[PDB]
Specification:
It is classed as hydrolase. The entry lists the keywords flap endonuclease, alternative conformations, hydrolase. This protein is α/β, with parallel strands linked by helices. The chain has helices at 8-12, 20-33, 49-54, 60-67, 71-94, 105-116, 156-160, 165-175, 190-200, 203-209, 217-223, 226-236, 238-247, 251-264, and strands at 2-7, 36-43, 97-99, 123-126, 140-143, 150-151. The protein is built from 14 helices and six strands. Helix 8 packs across helix 9. It is globular and about 60 Å long. Bound molecules: chloride ion (CL) (2 copies) and magnesium ion (3 copies).
Amino acid sequence: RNLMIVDGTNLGFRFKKPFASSYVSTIQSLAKSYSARTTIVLGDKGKSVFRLEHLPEYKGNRDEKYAQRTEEEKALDEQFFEYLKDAFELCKTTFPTFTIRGVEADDMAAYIVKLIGHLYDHVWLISTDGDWDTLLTDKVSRFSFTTRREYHLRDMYEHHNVDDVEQFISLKAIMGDLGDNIRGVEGIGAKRGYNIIREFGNVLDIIDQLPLPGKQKYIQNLNASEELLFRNLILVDLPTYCVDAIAAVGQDVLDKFTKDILEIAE
Ligand SMILES: [Cl-]
Ligand SMILES: [Cl-]
Ligand SMILES: [Mg+2]
Ligand SMILES: [Mg+2]
Ligand SMILES: [Mg+2]
């Protein structure tokens, strides 16, 4: 009776020897565990056109690390990606399996939840990515193979130091993301960020009130950061921008994906 959506490239890193059969078996076990009536496997192909258009430096740190690999280190990664390609090929014989050049799996997942989540009792997201918790609701949860935790909306403070999704999204916008090369406001950690949000509202409401009262240096920093906050919200507000992120590579591509997903449902 549930929907299960797999962050498939993310799951691939469990194995990072062909692993296609093992990969598919894992997904089957998961589908059983989570009573999945429907399982959809997603993968990352290329780079996020939507986010690179807004921030050319997006994941630039990761690109730099890839560029500094030796030829032999690179060849090994290519092998992993070949085995992963084979895993997706095999997976496609068994489950609906999607990749879209220039679109992050994150955006595809967010869109699926919005489009068909209402037809299922519960939605289970299979991802180690905390970013995916921007999708949590009373009927959408996440499972992580690295931490072994099941992530629920009711436990958002335990996991993310905020009480709800709106706050989570705003906190990410304020703090940025070191891993993905998104700059944050200097001097604002999770505590101060949560406190700011609880006082002034979400990031859009914060922007509307700049400059905010307060003599502390982090407030002065925040007051100077209108542009950064607005841009960051676009980069991190996965539910708001998922449709735009897909449409970035062509409206026709989005239309095909919609058609494909609606076919799977029902
Ligand atoms: Cl909940
Ligand atoms: Cl702006
Ligand atoms: Mg991702
Ligand atoms: Mg992500
Ligand atoms: Mg992140």
